[PDB]
Design a protein around this ligand. Sequence first.
Ligand SMILES: [Mg+2]
Ligand SMILES: [Mg+2]
Ligand SMILES: [Mg+2]
Ligand SMILES: [Mg+2]
Ligand SMILES: [Mg+2]
Ligand SMILES: [Mg+2]
Ligand SMILES: [Mg+2]
Ligand SMILES: [Mg+2]
Ligand SMILES: [Mg+2]
Ligand SMILES: [Mg+2]
Lengths: 50, 63, 50, 107, 59, 31
Amino acid sequence: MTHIVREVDRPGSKVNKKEVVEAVTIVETPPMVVVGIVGYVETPRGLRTF
Amino acid sequence: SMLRLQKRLASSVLRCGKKKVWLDPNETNEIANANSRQQIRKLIKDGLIIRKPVTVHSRARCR
Amino acid sequence: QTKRRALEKIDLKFIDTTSKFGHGRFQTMEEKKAFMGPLKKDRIAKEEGA
Amino acid sequence: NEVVTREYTINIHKRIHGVGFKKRAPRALKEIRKFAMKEMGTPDVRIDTRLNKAVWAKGIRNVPYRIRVRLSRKRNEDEDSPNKLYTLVTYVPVTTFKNLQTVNVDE
Amino acid sequence: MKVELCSFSGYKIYPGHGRRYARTDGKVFQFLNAKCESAFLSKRNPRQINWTVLYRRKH
Amino acid sequence: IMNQEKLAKLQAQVRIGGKGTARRKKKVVHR
RNA sequence: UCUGGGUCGGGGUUUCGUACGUAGCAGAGCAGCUCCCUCGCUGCGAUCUAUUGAAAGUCAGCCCUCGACACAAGGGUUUGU
RNA sequence: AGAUCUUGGUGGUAGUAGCAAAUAUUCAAACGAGAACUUUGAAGGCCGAAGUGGAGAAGGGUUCCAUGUGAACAGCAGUUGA
Ligand SMILES: [Mg+2]
Ligand SMILES: [Mg+2]
Ligand SMILES: [Mg+2]
Ligand SMILES: [Mg+2]
Ligand SMILES: [Mg+2]
Ligand SMILES: [Mg+2]
Ligand SMILES: [Mg+2]
Ligand SMILES: [Mg+2]
Ligand SMILES: [Mg+2]
Ligand SMILES: [Mg+2]
């Protein structure tokens, strides 16, 4: 986690065009690699793997 | 092997407590043969039993 | 997402990068060096570096 | 070979962290023995009395943070024993622990 | 990115860091951390604390 | 008399403790 | 494996706050020496100053190493339409 | 078959509750089949003279001392022991 500073664009608010400090969470996301495909079929018992 | 009697007799002969009695850890067999106060005296003479010096309690700080 | 909380444009002005391993007080290495100047270990490395 | 002797430095502070006051020096001895077993692969580890005196030098709870020891692997070919090798860990007094690598030492 | 403030130690206080102290007499002080705040509250002089900016520029 | 081999091992037997303890005076065998 | 993970070491971060020693015509003063000095020298003395944001710790559940060292294709018990 | 029956034996509970008042142990060696607990040495501590020290009265009665044993006992162990 860390925190940022940004200007708010919320009309009618007390923080309108005002700076705020907001806590943010950093989530590292290296690209996903696609290795398969699953198909599902709708059954009267639910979805089942086809 | 077990030298409780030797420590007690050495304390009695040396006129000190069992704290100050030092038995030679290498001559355990020779000391174990000592069963009488004459033999304790002989061991003290021969250097196998030593009265350890009094723990230092200085008064230089007090002075 | 139709509320004004959502679909609101976000424009950051500052991201805090102070050290989180304590009470960090310098954003970058260079800012810390420019504030604190040379140190003893810098001097002993620089004497060896001629 | 197998009669090698080496000089290590052990982060006692790293291995004792979190241990209660009345347990820090006995756990220091246990971690020293475990370190010797791991480094030399010998379950039979003998610790010099000078090393024990150095670990216990500052009492039971203020154990030194670092210590320089010497692990010597020696031939236990003295009697019929399950282990034919053993490690004698001796104490190496040093002034500073900066830039001390693990170095092989000759006989 | 906002107005940069200075502490009891003279260090820059970035947004979202430290505290701000407003006295009854009308003076507003800002501190970088609780160490500087406790030093200020105990009326310690920054010109005698070795790591403060004021001591550095005094010596 | 004392030579280098005798001296280097003599240092061991006279020390019966760490720093601050009295030195061993003698170890004499007599039958 | 285009090796790996450890253990030290290093660097980064951070915590505290300026280490031992040395030097000082710094220091409340005090005690001796006067061919000496013409205002000096020799000790004691909390504290101060410089060396010195120094010293010390920092993963054990902090970050990065490619420096050093040794170690890692090994052990056991089972499982079949 | 009963009498919260008498005496004796045995279960479940159950390898469970529990073996937590008074700071603390560690290293090496010896004996030994066998050592966390015995002994020696080294270290770290404690009682701190209104003591966990040194001696008595009452009470105990051989617990004193040495040697030997490792059946039982010392609610773990023991090469030790009242
Ligand atoms: Mg943090
Ligand atoms: Mg490091
Ligand atoms: Mg019946
Ligand atoms: Mg239980
Ligand atoms: Mg219990
Ligand atoms: Mg004490
Ligand atoms: Mg005491
Ligand atoms: Mg009494
Ligand atoms: Mg008896
Ligand atoms: Mg029992």
